Design a binder for this molecule. Structure first.
Ligand code: PT
Ligand code: PT
Ligand code: PT
Lengths: 81, 81, 81
């Protein structure tokens, strides 16, 4: 019983039924030193062959993987789904 | 002043009342070569003993450290909160 | 066409016009064995020199590369933008 009230509980309806956003991650492995995430995704980490924990991210999407010898690199990607 | 408008001033009032969620991360550390984020959390990266930077993710939430010898693993775990 | 609806045709259509939230990430690199994210960011992982997979995160913001000889260290940092 009130005009500006109906409008509010009306919102606490839709507001309370939009399902909320969440993180989804996936991995991309590639041969060599470079492994890139798809556009629309951030790189949160890199893994690397030869037990190589030295890596660096290039163009904000690619895992450069940086030791004497490198079979494969890998890029963890995340984003809001 | 217009039958709509007042409505938008109502949405765009107590909508600025919404408290935006933020990333919250945490680590999980286990002996051997596996470490899992509790479900509801994604895995963003892994760490391994023996300076082992070769890992891979198994079953969407599990850090698998993968060098020959291996004593602990940690998963880095993030969630919206 | 009916006057509970006139309302949500604004609600469920300023939600879509809103400001959809997004992840951003970035690396911080420092000589030594430590590296720190700025405030407002979660650490999603670390890199190390001499190829370390072994690292841990302290005080919620500091990559501690934890091998023995240690060049440099890296943190990966993320926030909602
Ligand atoms: Pt994607
Ligand atoms: Pt959790
Ligand atoms: Pt920042």
């Amino acid at each position: 019983c009130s005009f500006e009230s109906l409008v509010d509980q009306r919102i606490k309806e839709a507001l309370s039924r939009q399902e909320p956003k969440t993180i989804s991650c996936t991995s991309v492995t590639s041969s060599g030193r470079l492994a890139s995430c798809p556009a629309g995704m951030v790189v949160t980490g890199c893994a690397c062959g030869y037990g190589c924990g030295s890596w660096d991210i290039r163009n904000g999407n690619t895992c450069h993987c940086q030791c004497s010898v490198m079979d494969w690199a890998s890029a963890r990607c995340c984003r809001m789904a």
